[PDB]
Amino acid sequence: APILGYWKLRGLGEPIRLLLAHTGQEYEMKEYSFGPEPDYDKSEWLDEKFNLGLDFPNLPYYIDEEEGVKMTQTVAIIRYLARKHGLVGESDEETIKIEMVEQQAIELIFTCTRTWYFDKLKEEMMTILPGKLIGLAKFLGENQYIIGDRITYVDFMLYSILDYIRLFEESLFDEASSLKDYLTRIESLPEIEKYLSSDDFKRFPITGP
């Protein structure tokens, strides 16, 4: 069976795990745990990192012996599963929109892990994010999903990162309420609800120590 490896955190793994849930794909989850305080050693990972046949060793990774796939890179992993489950654009027009939003999503990840991993930084996130969330609200418009009536991989990516931000400071979404309905639309998908109601599910931690 396919293996998804990652830390015991939501982090970058979650959008992938949400996609696997929605699609019903069987996979084994290989979770690597950090060390005790304040060591926080990554040995569980570092001792295996270079021995898994990965071209660019890193977390997350995705392995499927049957298909001959050993992969790293979150966007590349989720793009791979999306094309395997038809969660991609059916037109270049759609694909343009999807890939803009993919990159807009990662732009929020990138400048959130610059703040979370900072008095002057958290002050600066607060000034920027509102305009970015307004942009996304204006893009979603009255659509059920970011690209329209059909759910695509980019909805899972957007879900995770917007949740992270909501948990950080909900006040930011005050000027973008549509997203809260969007986050609920996604939370109400049958397999996502079942994933979010697991015993294994833990909204925290999202990032490491």
Residues annotated within the binding site for glutathione are 6-7, 42, 45, 49, 58-59, 74
Are the C-beta atoms of residues 56 and 83 closer than 8 Å to each other?
Answer: no
Which one, 12 or 129, has the nearer CB to ligand GSH? 12
Reference 147, options 96, 103, 77, 78; nearest CA is: 96
Smallest distance from the beta carbon of 31 to ligand GSH, in angstroms?
A: 13
DSSP E strands: which ranges in the chain? 3-7, 28-32, 61-64, 69-72
* Per-residue contact string for residues 132-161; x = within reach of ligand GSH by CB under 6 A: ------------------------------
Give 44-87 as a DSSP string: HHHTTGGGS--SS--SSEEEETTTTEEEE-HHHHHHHHHHHTT-
Quick check: 8 binds ligand GSH (CB under 6 A)? no
* Per-residue contact string for residues 35-74; x = within reach of ligand GSH by CB under 6 A: -------x--x---x--------xxx-----------xxx
Backbone angles phi, psi at 142, to 5 degrees: -95, 15
Binds a second copy (CB under 8 A): choice among 104, 159, 173, 182: 104
Binds ligand GSH (CB under 6 A): choice among 4, 11, 80, 173: 11
Residue 53's region, left for phi above 0, alpha for psi from -120 to 50, else beta, is left
Smallest distance from the beta carbon of 90 to a second copy, in angstroms?
A: 14
